[PDB]
């Protein structure tokens, strides 16, 4: 509650409050256009499951200056 009431004390600017995710593209629409969407990141790990799950968005792993998208059924 304190967080939200505090955000409202900032009128509409949100400039340091759009809550990182920076319009990271995560695929394409089901017609061809881009799908930029705000997305909070989360890092995880699973040792039993090995995360061959389809849906990878970035061939080269990581997060730096320079992102490169995957053949996610373009």
């Amino acid at each position: 509650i304190t967080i939200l009431d505090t955000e409202k004390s900032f009128l509409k600017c949100m400039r340091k409050a759009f809550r990182s995710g920076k319009l990271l593209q995560v695929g394409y629409t089901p017609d061809g256009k881009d799908d930029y969407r705000w997305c909070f990141r989360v890092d995880e790990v699973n040792w039993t499951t090995w995360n061959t799950n389809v849906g990878i968005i970035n061939e080269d792993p990581g997060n730096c200056e320079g992102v490169k998208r995957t053949l996610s059924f373009s």
């Binding site: 939200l4 759009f18 849906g55 968005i57």
Partner: protein
């Protein structure tokens, strides 16, 4: 309907956080979206509005349907042609590690009926105000 609730607005409402419901509703909630994608791939069913203003997610968080609120946020549709609907996407996954991208479109204080605006400011009559905020993205 007379209240304006659609199919999805009902599936949220009919649940009561029990196991069988939650096992059930999330599944039917899955399929109809897959169908509504395959049939009419423009209808944003999760963005339609009942007469009270609340979207399905908004209704879920409002009335306090934790199991549904889990699914709607941390879904993942592997099925191609209907991946746009998913939220818990996975970016880079170097073996055991995998970095995920819990979507935020309707759960940050930018939209009118954001869940987090609803969950906190709502009445105490809504059961499980607390346990909703222990879902994975909202907590962190």
């Amino acid at each position: 309907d007379s209240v304006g609730n659609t199919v999805l607005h009902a599936l949220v409402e009919v649940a009561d956080n029990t196991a069988d419901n939650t096992k059930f509703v999330t599944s039917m909630y899955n399929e109809i979206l897959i169908l509504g994608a395959k049939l009419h791939p423009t209808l944003k069913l999760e963005e339609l509005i009942n007469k009270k203003g609340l979207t399905p997610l908004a209704l879920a968080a409002s009335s306090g349907k934790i199991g549904v609120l889990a699914y709607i946020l941390q879904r993942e549709i592997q099925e191609p042609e209907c991946r746009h609907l998913s939220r818990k996407f996975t970016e880079w996954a170097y073996g055991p590690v995998h970095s995920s991208l819990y979507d935020l479109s309707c759960i940050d204080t930018c939209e009118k009926n954001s869940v987090l605006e609803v969950i906190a400011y709502s009445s105490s009559e809504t059961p499980n105000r607390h346990d909703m905020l222990l879902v994975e993205p909202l907590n962190r």
